[PDB]
Design a protein around this ligand. Sequence first.
Ligand SMILES: [Cl-]
Ligand SMILES: [Cl-]
Ligand SMILES: [Cl-]
Length: 163
Amino acid sequence: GAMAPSYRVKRMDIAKNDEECVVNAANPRGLPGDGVCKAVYKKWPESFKNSATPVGTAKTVMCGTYPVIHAVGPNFSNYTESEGDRELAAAYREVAKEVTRLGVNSVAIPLLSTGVYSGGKDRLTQSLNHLFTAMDSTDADVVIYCRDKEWEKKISEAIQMRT
Ligand SMILES: [Cl-]
Ligand SMILES: [Cl-]
Ligand SMILES: [Cl-]
């Protein structure tokens, strides 16, 4: 575990993370995809061997000795608000189980279902709160990656609000 388990946020490409493993915002089919998923495919393409997994789950595949945890959030274009919320919570719970199993001291994680799976809504608070519900009981250092300056400020404020 980390000596003083923490949450942090950085505004940069998660493919350039400084953590012991990465969470991919995957599609269920293990396809290269776009956004975070395409960056992850370019950096760790070996991790997409048999990475297909259903919505609400996470599947880890090693790239060398570096673990890539493929976490499949719901596409809110297809799910109801109610069912989508349940599957988004479940995907983060499966990430917490994998991070624990791997014995890593740190993990890089994007906000699931906030980009092309958002169904055109702002889901920063929804997705971040499900991330906290899952990861709070883990002792890995968690580093959240985002691309937008306003999102960085809101995620940083939400972390600091608990501290
Ligand atoms: Cl960058
Ligand atoms: Cl997304
Ligand atoms: Cl962002």
